[PDB]
Amino acid sequence: LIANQFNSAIGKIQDSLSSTPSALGKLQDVVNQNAQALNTLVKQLSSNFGAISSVLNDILSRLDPPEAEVQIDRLITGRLQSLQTYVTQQLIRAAEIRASANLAATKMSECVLGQSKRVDFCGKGYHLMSFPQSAPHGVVFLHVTYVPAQEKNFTTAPAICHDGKAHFPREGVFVSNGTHWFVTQRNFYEPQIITTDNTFVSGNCDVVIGIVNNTVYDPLQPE
Amino acid sequence: PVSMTKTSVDCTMYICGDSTECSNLLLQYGSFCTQLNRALTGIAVEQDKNTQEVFAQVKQIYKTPPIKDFGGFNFSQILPDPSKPSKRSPIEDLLFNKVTFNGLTVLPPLLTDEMIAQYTSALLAGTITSGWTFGAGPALQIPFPMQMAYRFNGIGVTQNVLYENQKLIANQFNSAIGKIQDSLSSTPSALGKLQDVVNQNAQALNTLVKQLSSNFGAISSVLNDILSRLDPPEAEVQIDRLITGRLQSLQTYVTQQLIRAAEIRASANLAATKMSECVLGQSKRVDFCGKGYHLMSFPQSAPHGVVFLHVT
Amino acid sequence: NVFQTRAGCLIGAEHVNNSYECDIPIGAGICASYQQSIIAYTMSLGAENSVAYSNNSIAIPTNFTISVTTEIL
Ligand SMILES: *[C@@H]1O[C@H](CO)[C@@H](O[C@@H]2O[C@H](CO)[C@@H](O)[C@H](O)[C@H]2NC(C)=O)[C@H](O)[C@H]1NC(C)=O
Ligand SMILES: *[C@@H]1O[C@H](CO)[C@@H](O[C@@H]2O[C@H](CO)[C@@H](O)[C@H](O)[C@H]2NC(C)=O)[C@H](O)[C@H]1NC(C)=O
Ligand SMILES: *[C@@H]1O[C@H](CO)[C@@H](O[C@@H]2O[C@H](CO)[C@@H](O)[C@H](O)[C@H]2NC(C)=O)[C@H](O)[C@H]1NC(C)=O
Ligand SMILES: *[C@@H]1O[C@H](CO)[C@@H](O[C@@H]2O[C@H](CO)[C@@H](O)[C@H](O)[C@H]2NC(C)=O)[C@H](O)[C@H]1NC(C)=O
Ligand SMILES: *[C@@H]1O[C@H](CO)[C@@H](O)[C@H](O)[C@H]1NC(C)=O
Ligand SMILES: *[C@@H]1O[C@H](CO)[C@@H](O)[C@H](O)[C@H]1NC(C)=O
Ligand SMILES: *[C@@H]1O[C@H](CO)[C@@H](O)[C@H](O)[C@H]1NC(C)=O
């Protein structure tokens, strides 16, 4: 069943990526920002900035150097200002991209090379494993996680009183199905008979609040 | 801090006011402040993205039971108070009380303070009634002492200690929760981090506005005076100097805003990580969720920020 | 027709009592979407949920799903 669920999830992920054009919007946003910055930088070359013309060749072939120097200086000032603006924007965007790349490297180290206990760091749910995938100017992580489902109601007690002693669950939790009491793991309903090898004794039945009466099986009594 | 105030500054109204000749002269510089407007709008959108990433992490809006009996622990200082006409917890109210044209506009945030308070209430109710389960799937109810027994077991202490000292631990928790409010009320410098962001943005706007009274070598710092005292062929010379100075001031403001927005985005990503790990679960990372061995965390909304109560 | 919000006022969108997930952010809790005309509403943070809590009730999953999600960086 787990293998079938894993295969179905992989197929659904592939279909969702194929049928939705907005899935990869982050990389497209980065590409669009870079391309638009380049386009603006190039289009800045058609501005007079106060000069007689925006073309250096026209200014050169129309005026003598002593009078064309002012126009060339105005063009130089404008173009240098535009280039500095572009460079500053590129530096800021590069810093943002470096932060994103550091995050991606951390996710690759912790989600793929191992199992991460960090909540929601490697996908929503209890992280099981991850698979890296290459993308143009980016990385796509396939987070495989365990999502519990089909829960039901149980009556729980903090401890079990037996022979004037308090028993606490060693690994799981005490539950009741209506008439009997069992001990089951916290993330999955696998009830078991309350014995002395899955509970531990600490004190009497006078300190714990809400302790209930039940019989603790002893595996040695039959023999 | 999570987000800062969203400011939109217009080119033609700031540099040139309502002067058509100044706009015609400004057209010669190209598309400098199409870029400036775009950058400011991008920062404005990023602020709403920060708030969404921090607070909008849960899908459902969980509610606490009408009868609030959690085995001696009481959360009256962090649960919403229906008596006030704000649906804020007392600590959130104290936090909201501690914090104190020329083409400039302030865009209201996408999420109002009441909606952020609803998100915080949903997270608190989920943590109280279901522990860390609601952050990783369906919300499974669990008695609060039993959840604290799990959290005690998560730091290397057997769960019988909590059951044998339940009322003592509840008393200690309540006392610390009350001391948090007393310390916040009695110390005006507690919320310095948020006030720094507020002060920096206000100072930047004030300097940008005060740059409108600079001559920049022109005969006057008022464009109307230059237009009313000179003919075009001479007035354009003065208007050029004014345009250069005002444009470079606006570019400086935009660059400073971009860098400070990068700062705020880094802080908001850290806040989102802390909400995902310290609040929605129990973290084994040392000093990430407060000094000591982490037991749990409680989020609280603050104006342009988030406050975590790390129980350890 | 004409609606007054905190972020200015909106002309050409019909204000409704209903609440849906935000489609086009307007501001101050107001969002707009196309249904057939353009409607403006107050965004809903999610479905209402109230988990039944008592001192002695627990919920334990009995079954599970393996879920795979994508994260792009
Ligand atoms: C709670 O669990 C117990 C233990 O499995 C159930 O008792 C069993 O009931 C079935 C059906 O009547 C019998 O065939 C078994 O012999 C019983 N086992 C024992 C050990 O007595 C009990 O019915 C369950 N109760 C509910 C309400 O589901
Ligand atoms: C659980 O069982 C214990 C005994 O194992 C019960 O304690 C008895 O309580 C009665 C009524 O107060 C006393 O007269 C007895 O002396 C107690 N016995 C012991 C050994 O202390 C206890 O009441 C039971 N709990 C429930 C809920 O029925
Ligand atoms: C929860 O703790 C709070 C601490 O503020 C208690 O609220 C105060 O209770 C005293 C009586 O003990 C009243 O005089 C105050 O007016 C209360 N303050 C407020 C703001 O309501 C509250 O009683 C405690 N709850 C329980 C169940 O013990
Ligand atoms: C746990 O969940 C899986 C699916 O998530 C259930 O498998 C289904 O079982 C029914 C009943 O036999 C079949 O009709 C379906 O085709 C199965 N689906 C899949 C995907 O295999 C499974 O039954 C659940 N377990 C229990 C005990 O209810
Ligand atoms: C448990 O019982 C409560 C009682 O109100 C009910 O609301 C809830 O749906 C039940 N839980 C399950 C998992 O069926
Ligand atoms: C749960 O609440 C009821 C009602 O007061 C009480 O009688 C019962 O003892 C409580 N259980 C525990 C374990 O505190
Ligand atoms: C929206 O709901 C309120 C309820 O207070 C009602 O008075 C109002 O008329 C409704 N708006 C419209 C457009 O029907």
UniProtKB/Swiss-Prot annotation, chain B:
Function: Precursor of the fusion protein processed in the biosynthesis of the S protein and the formation of virus particle. Mediates fusion of the virion and cellular membranes by functioning as a class I viral fusion protein. Contains two viral fusion peptides that are unmasked after cleavage. The S2/S2' cleavage occurs during virus entry at the cell membrane by host TMPRSS2 or during endocytosis by host CSTL.
Effect after changing N102K: In strain: Omicron/BA.1
Residues covered by region (Heptad repeat 1): 166-216
Coiled-coil segments on the chain, per record: 195-239
Protein name (database record): Spike protein S2
Annotated positions for site Cleavage: R88, S89
Lineage: Viruses, Riboviria, Orthornavirae, Pisuviricota, Pisoniviricetes
Record-annotated disulphide pairs: C11-C33, C16-C22, C278-C289
Gene name, Swiss-Prot/TrEMBL: S
Residues of the full protein shown: 728 to 1066 of 1273
Result when mutating D69H: In strain: B.1.1.318
Sugar-bearing residue positions: N74
